[PDB]
Amino acid sequence: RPDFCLEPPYTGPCKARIIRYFYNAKAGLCQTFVYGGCRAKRNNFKSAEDCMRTCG
Amino acid sequence: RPDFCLEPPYTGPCKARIIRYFYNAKAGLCQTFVYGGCRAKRNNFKSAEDCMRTCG
Amino acid sequence: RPDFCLEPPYTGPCKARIIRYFYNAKAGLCQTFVYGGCRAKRNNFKSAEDCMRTCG
Amino acid sequence: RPDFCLEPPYTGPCKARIIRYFYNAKAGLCQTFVYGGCRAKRNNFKSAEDCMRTCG
Amino acid sequence: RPDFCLEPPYTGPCKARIIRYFYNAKAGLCQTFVYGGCRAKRNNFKSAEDCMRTCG
Amino acid sequence: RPDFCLEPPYTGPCKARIIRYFYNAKAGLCQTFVYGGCRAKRNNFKSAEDCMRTCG
Amino acid sequence: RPDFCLEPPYTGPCKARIIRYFYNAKAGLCQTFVYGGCRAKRNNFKSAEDCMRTCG
Amino acid sequence: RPDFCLEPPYTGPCKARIIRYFYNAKAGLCQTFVYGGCRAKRNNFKSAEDCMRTCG
Amino acid sequence: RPDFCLEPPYTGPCKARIIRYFYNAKAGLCQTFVYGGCRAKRNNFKSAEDCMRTCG
Amino acid sequence: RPDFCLEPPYTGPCKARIIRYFYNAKAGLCQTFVYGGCRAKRNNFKSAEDCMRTCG
């Protein structure tokens, strides 16, 4: 499992309010958080599928 | 019909304005509510189809 | 966890070749399968999010 | 509810494999069916929410 | 065309600003409006094809 | 309305099967047809909204 | 091309902020503008494809 | 406009039948074609806005 | 690669909050940025694939 | 850069023609391949954005 999947989700400094998915290491599944629209870190997925499959 | 299908919709603490679907037991079908983007409860569906079939 | 999440995925008799998601009880996560487009059973989700959240 | 809501789903002659939604009076909910692309009848919805709200 | 197709469009008390279609009986065509995310009335269509097929 | 709104729908030579909208001068509204993927003619719209707005 | 392809883009009175396309008669192509959600005018397309096809 | 915008559209050896846009240098506008799913050449756009902004 | 690929992202003046993609020469890949809705500059892509293929 | 980012794309045994993204290490960016719809390996991304960030 990529180390980056253990990083807290990261909204960044931008205005948008968009759903993205991140791996919650502790709950052990992908959840939703709000993403500003810029300067994404790696635990950030457009698609929940991609999320589970990358950090499952 | 899972228990969670009877809990009221939960916006959550986040500040997004994301349309979602919850099963309305009183009414007997899925309806739209506004989801804040994080900390979702289980009566929350990105897809209306998924909502009617899971809670139908 | 809804009992229906333990049912094998079910393509049905229709022509379409569409991705949908089902809960693989054994692997313990949601995966892709092909859905014919009609006569869905309950372990079938338009959205991977909805899938995890309903059968996680 | 409207009366076209009582018609059976019509795939029509054309060759596309597009998921659409029809009200199924019997089961009392909107379901998926394959629409062929041309010559649709009235019990036929692009959006499941439209179907639940119109024929629900 | 069903009676509700004559109801004026209804935004609702919710906080989203999402595009929906309504049948405008005067002009005799479907048009856009802003729906606020919840408590939609029946003359409210996510898809335009559904609006004109159901009300036009 | 533009004179192109009257010409029949042109599926074209290509092999794809994509739902597109066209103005049905006779029936007075926009209906679906199957576009092939190339050599489109002008009575051909990706969006049903656009079709009614332009040819309605 | 239709005479409506020349009129300026009409954002309108409504509160939404939706990206739409319009024909820029001057620059000779379709550009983006922000539509408000209601009282659209005809130089307004949901699909960029439609815009170039109609006004190009 | 970059040179590749002049390359004719390329379907590829793959088996899908997906709509894409290419700049057609003769006509001087972007148009549709069928891409087969793999080994796209650069004059191949998922979005039309991107095609005309990049090649038009 | 084209030279507009070297420009910095431009949000422009308008108020929408739409994720778009720009090539970031420094990091050597396309990234997200917020586009405002009007007056886009050329290093601006609706689709990430378009961005990677055009400026990759 | 996870190991899986270097495995070749895998269509799988299913018969869908679903566009997806894999990271091409040889080329140094994500490209499209055709995914059969089941039994996906990890170098499979519904979203190009997710692909470039996970394997970039």
Tell whether G2 is within 8 A of chain F (Cβ): yes
Q: Return the number of other C-beta atoms located less than 10 Å from residue G13's C-beta.
A: 9
Integer Cα distance of C10 and C38 in angstroms:
10
Experimental method: X-ray
Integer Cα distance of F24 and F29 in angstroms:
5
SS3 state at I49: helix
H/E stretch holding F52 reads: helix F48-55
Question: Which residue, J10, J14, J36, J38, is CA-closest to J22?
Answer: J10
Question: Which residue, G7, G14, G17, is CA-closest to G44?
Answer: G7
- F14: CB partners within 8 A, 6+ apart: F36, F37, F38, F39, H33, H34
Residue whose pair of structure tokens reads 């003769």 in the numeric block = H26
Provide φ and ψ at B51, rounded to 5°.
-65, -50
Q: Is the dihedral of CA H21, H22, H23, H29 positive or negative?
A: negative
Integer Cα distance of J16 and A47 in angstroms:
19
Tell me the β-bridge partners of I22.
I31
**D30, D45 Cβ separation under 8 angstroms:** yes
Residues in chain G with CB shorter than 8 Å from the CB of F49 are: 46
Residues in chain I with CB shorter than 8 Å from the CB of J28 are: 56
Tell me the β-bridge partners of J31.
J22
SS3 state at I30: strand
The closest CB to that of H44, out of I40, I45, I53, belongs to I53
Question: Which residue, D29, D4, D7, D9, is CA-closest to D20?
Answer: D9
- J20: CB partners within 8 A, 6+ apart: J9, J32, J33, J34, J35, J44, J45, J46
Integer Cα distance of C23 and C9 in angstroms:
8
- J14: CB partners within 8 A, 6+ apart: C33, C34, J36, J37, J38, J39
* Burial zone of H54 (CB within 10 Å; 0-12 exposed, 13-18 middle, 19+ buried): buried
Integer Cα distance of E35 and E19 in angstroms:
6
Residue D21: closest C-alpha in chain E: E50
Residues in chain G with CB shorter than 8 Å from the CB of H56 are: 29
Integer Cα distance of B48 and B50 in angstroms:
5
Integer Cα distance of H4 and H15 in angstroms:
24
Integer Cα distance of F29 and F48 in angstroms:
10
Q: Where are the beta strands (DSSP E) in I1-56?
A: 18-24, 29-35
What are the residue ranges spanned by the domains of chain G?
A: 1-56
Q: Tell me, what amino acid is at I43?
A: N
The domain made up of D1-56 is a member of CATH 3.40.50.410: no
Tell me the β-bridge partners of I23.
I30
Q: Return the number of other C-beta atoms located less than 10 Å from residue H28's C-beta.
A: 12
Interface of G with H in 28-47 (CB under 8 A): 29-30, 32, 47
- C39: CB partners within 8 A, 6+ apart: C10, C12, C13, C14, D31
Provide φ and ψ at H4, rounded to 5°.
-60, -25
The angstrom resolution of this structure is 2.6
Q: Is the dihedral of CA E1, E2, E7, E11 positive or negative?
A: negative
